[PDB]
């Protein structure tokens, strides 16, 4: 263990609170889900709470949850 | 409860002292 | 000085608990400061248990158990020996004896 506070461990940081990390940063990412109907992927927010609609479909494709959004229909997460 | 009984005795005597002042003035 | 940290009652995150009556002394004690011992005794005495079963006509009968929760005040408990004055170190021991 020669690890220093100045250069913090990379994977250790994600075990800390976002605010208490050496640099405050988002714990959320934008995923590129693939809607079953359209071959084109749809950018989605990881912790989405508002209704999100897949382009070309009239059904909400996001089930809102306490934290990270769950996705109602078949989707390919393809995080990007 | 001597301290509570002391304040009961005090209140009773101040009530009486008020009655005497009510008889006067 | 302060003999016990719990103050003699388990009141945490609370300003007021329910009132229980000591069964022997009929006093009002808070729920936290109560003996609360739950006892399951068989309805009959164990001396008369086997002879009741022999007498019982019903086959496969099981003797009823009596389930009761005896709650007492500190005075109505130390005098019945349900709880005992302990040494200052022994007082800290929270584990039930036996």
């Amino acid at each position: 263990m020669n690890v220093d506070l100045l250069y913090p461990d990379p994977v250790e940081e994600q075990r800390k609170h976002k605010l208490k990390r050496l640099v405050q940063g988002p714990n959320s990412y934008f995923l590129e889900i693939k809607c079953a109907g359209c071959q084109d992927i749809v950018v989605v927010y990881s912790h989405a709470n508002t209704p999100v609609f897949c382009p070309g479909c009239t059904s909400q494709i996001s089930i809102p949850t306490g934290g990270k959004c769950a996705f109602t229909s078949q989707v390919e997460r393809y995080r990007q | 409860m001597r301290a509570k009984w002391a304040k009961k005795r005090m209140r009773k005597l101040k009530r009486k002292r008020r009655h005497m002042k009510a008889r006067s003035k | 000085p302060v003999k016990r940290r719990n103050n003699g009652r388990s009141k945490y995150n609370c300003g007021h608990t329910n009132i229980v009556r000591c069964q022997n002394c009929h006093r009002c004690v808070p729920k936290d400061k109560v003996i609360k011992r739950f006892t399951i005794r068989n309805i009959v005495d164990n001396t008369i248990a086997d002879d009741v079963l022999n007498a019982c006509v019903i086959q496969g009968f099981a003797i009823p158990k009596l389930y009761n929760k005896v709650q007492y005040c500190v005075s109505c408990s130390i005098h019945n020996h349900i709880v005992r004055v302990r040494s200052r170190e022994d007082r800290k021991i929270r584990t039930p004896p036996k």
């Binding site: 100045l6 050496l22 640099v23 | - | -």
Partner: protein, 129 residues
């Protein structure tokens, strides 16, 4: 709320030294904190310190060498007349020879000895001995 940025910093350094921790982090970084620490680095009481940028108040990772004994702030910062500096040094610091009193001056943040040589006085930021 967080009225004094420097007090929390020098407390979080003294606590770390007592534990024996080599490096510590200060949650809010001020320009006056950097000037107080810079004075301690030019007096040998501290080691390298690096201000990370969080795009807000900023953090400071401070390296220590066990050399520092006590670091504090005088609040409210009382303006000290030039002839009053010595009376402060006779109570705040142990020994007229060792210690430092950090006072903000019109010339800049300076130790009591530097202020005495320039023959000017100023508001006391704090002290490190």
């Amino acid at each position: 709320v967080r009225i004094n940025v420097l007090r929390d910093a020098l407390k979080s350094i003294c606590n770390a030294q007592r534990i024996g921790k080599k490096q510590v982090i200060v949650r809010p970084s001020s320009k006056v904190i950097i000037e107080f620490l810079q004075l301690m680095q030019k007096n040998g009481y501290i080691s390298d310190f690096a201000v990370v940028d969080n795009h807000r108040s900023n953090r400071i990772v401070v390296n220590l060498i066990g050399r520092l004994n006590k670091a504090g702030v005088i609040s409210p910062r009382f303006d000290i007349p030039a002839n009053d500096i010595e009376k402060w040094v006779v109570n705040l610091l142990p020994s007229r020879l060792f210690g430092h009193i950090i006072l903000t001056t019109s010339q800049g943040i300076m130790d009591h000895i530097e202020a005495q040589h320039r023959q000017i006085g100023g508001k006391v930021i704090g002290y490190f001995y």
